[PDB]
Amino acid sequence: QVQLVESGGGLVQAGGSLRLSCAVSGRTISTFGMGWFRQAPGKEREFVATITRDEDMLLYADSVKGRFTISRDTAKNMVFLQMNSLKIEDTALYYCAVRRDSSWGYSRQSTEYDYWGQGTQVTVSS
Amino acid sequence: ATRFASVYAWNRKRISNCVADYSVLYNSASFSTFKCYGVSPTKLNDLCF
Amino acid sequence: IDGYFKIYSKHTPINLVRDLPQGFSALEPLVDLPIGINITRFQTLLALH
């Protein structure tokens, strides 16, 4: 698959914040969702907040405590998300490409994909 | 907690009487409990399935 | 209609021996049944001693 444009991604870093983002298929349209789930063997995986198509409801914590996520851009449509404090340990591959699922929703058990795929083999666990 | 079982014996109902207690969290503590796929819970208010 | 079975009812005290009475009385809605089952005939149930 062809890699999609991004403005920063990969393993998280301690302290501060990272505006994880990935280019979306649509252009100048913000009525789309997004998912940042990373698939990899083992228990070294943490749930990641999801954004619905409507965009009125933000993250699994609801808009009551969340912050608006930018999903519109001029040069290239992109989605911006804010990352909460999490453990630096990570072992799953990162591949910002075309998403395998487009029916974004508010579900929690739902994941980006079941199996793994092509991507960078960066790991800081083992 | 009444007249219910697992997936093999779930209970089936339909009536325009009320909504079960799951909407308690849908006022100020709307967690991911309302697992919606493809659509957002807000769209339910505007229109239904 | 459109899969919605509606039942209306109304009770009115009377004093008659034969035939229906005169007057007007609206039938307030009772309950809407979204069973959506094809309907073509019906029968009545009575209590027999």
Swiss-Prot record, chain B:
Source organism of this protein record: Severe acute respiratory syndrome coronavirus 2 (2019-nCoV)
Subunit structure: Binds to host ACE2. RBD also interacts with the N-linked glycan on 'Asn-90' of ACE2. Cleavage of S generates a polybasic C-terminal sequence on S1 that binds to host Neuropilin-1 (NRP1) and Neuropilin-2 (NRP2) receptors. Interacts with host integrin alpha-5/beta-1 (ITGA5:ITGB1) and with ACE2 in complex with integrin alpha-5/beta-1 (ITGA5:ITGB1). May interact via cytoplasmic c-terminus with M protein. May interact (via N-terminus) with host bilirubin and biliverdin, thereby preventing antibody binding to the SARS-CoV-2 spike NTD via an allosteric mechanism.
Interval of the full protein contained in this chain: 344 to 392 of 1273
Effect of R3K: In strain: Mu/B.1.621
Outcome after substituting S28F: In strain: Omicron/BA.2, Omicron/BA.2.12.1, Omicron/BA.2.75, Omicron/BA.4, Omicron/BA.5, Omicron/BQ.1.1, Omicron/XBB.1.5, Omicron/EG.5.1
Effect seen on changing R3T: In strain: Omicron/BQ.1.1, Omicron/XBB.1.5, Omicron/EG.5.1
Domain of life assignment: Viruses
Effect of mutating L25I: In strain: Omicron/XBB.1.5, Omicron/EG.5.1
Annotated phenotype, changing S28L: In strain: Omicron/BA.1
Name of the protein this chain belongs to: Spike protein S1
Annotated phenotype, changing T33A: In strain: Omicron/BA.2, Omicron/BA.2.12.1, Omicron/BA.4, Omicron/BA.5, Omicron/BQ.1.1, Omicron/XBB.1.5, Omicron/EG.5.1
Role of this protein: Attaches the virion to the cell membrane by interacting with host receptor, initiating the infection. The major receptor is host ACE2. When S2/S2' has been cleaved, binding to the receptor triggers direct fusion at the cell membrane. When S2/S2' has not been cleaved, binding to the receptor results in internalization of the virus by endocytosis using host TFRC and GRM2 and leading to fusion of the virion membrane with the host endosomal membrane. Alternatively, may use NRP1/NRP2 and integrin as entry receptors.
